[PDB]
Amino acid sequence: DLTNLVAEPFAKLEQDFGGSIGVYAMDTGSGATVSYRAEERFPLCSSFKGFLAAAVLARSQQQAGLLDTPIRYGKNALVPWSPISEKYLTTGMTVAELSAAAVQYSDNAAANLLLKELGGPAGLTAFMRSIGDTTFRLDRWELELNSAIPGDARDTSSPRAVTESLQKLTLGSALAAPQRQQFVDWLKGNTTGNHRIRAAVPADWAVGDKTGTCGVYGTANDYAVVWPTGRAPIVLAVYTRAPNKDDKHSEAVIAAAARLALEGLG
């Protein structure tokens, strides 16, 4: 199999990039995996917002009316990159709309308001422990969680823990069937990842994804569930970082790493 023939191409890719690339991909058919730096910590950046939305849905299972609960917020809630929350400043938005905004537009104000609802970064971390993720940690809010300082474990996970948690939430039994499909539909409607894992995948394969872009230390990422035509779904996570604050992230590198991960599962 091709599982142990991706290390050299990944090394070449991270050397051309000027940093570190972390990948974990899982064929849910065979159980086969592709692993490269899959147990190293990488900053989550905005990628935590997918798991934030999952945590809201998990709580909605035992709390009727959570998703339709109106959240009234002031201008003080608006932080940079809040493209949806900005437009509903005067009316407020439901828990469901904030969740959709956080997943599909990486809306920062929406993410912070939802974090408040779940008991802050500690609350989301506790949710991730409750589905058996012992790696994920969120420590800060938007936008301070984006500092992405080399060796700083704050606001990080591993590509493997991300992929495993994503599998449990989208395909396993961590969410009830309506909540599971809603999480899948939110990820499928993501607008920020067209130049990442989606660019590594045939156009007629269904894809749901959540992106992260710290804006520093060449630190960016994408995770996705992929449904190949007539085959068991594939789950994968691609995380990058670089040693200098002004190193540029690359969407093309994330796409190329996704292509290698999928080819590696051949």
Burial per residue of 128-161, b for 16 or more beta-carbon CB atoms within 10 angstroms, e otherwise: beebebebbbbeebbbebbbbeeeeebbbbbbbb
On the CB side of 84, CA atoms within 13 Å amount to 21
Q: Is 85 a catalytic residue?
A: no
Is 60 annotated to bind ligand? Answer: no
DSSP letter assigned to residue 56: H
Consult the annotation and say whether 49 binds a ligand: yes
Taken in order 105, 106, 109, 113, is the CA torsion positive or negative?
positive
Instruction: Give how far Cα 138 sits from Cα of 168, 219, 228, 248, Å.
Output: 19, 16, 32, 24
28 assigned binding-site residue: no
* Residue 85, marked binder: no
CA distance 133 to 67: 24
Catalytic member of 46, 47, 60, 250:
46
Q: Is 144 designated active site?
A: yes
**Contacts (Cβ under 8 Å, ≥6 apart) of 49:** 102, 103, 106, 111, 210
**What residue has token string 């520093």?**
216
How many helices (H) and strands (E) the chain has is answered by 8, 9
Instruction: Confirm whether residue 219 is marked as ligand binding.
Output: no
Which of 30, 86, 130, 144 is catalytic? The answer is 144
Task: Pick out the residues of the known binding site for a beta-lactam.
Answer: 46, 49, 81, 106, 108, 211, 213
Task: Pick out the residues of the known binding site.
Answer: 46, 49, 81, 106, 108, 211, 213
Active site residue ranges: 46, 144
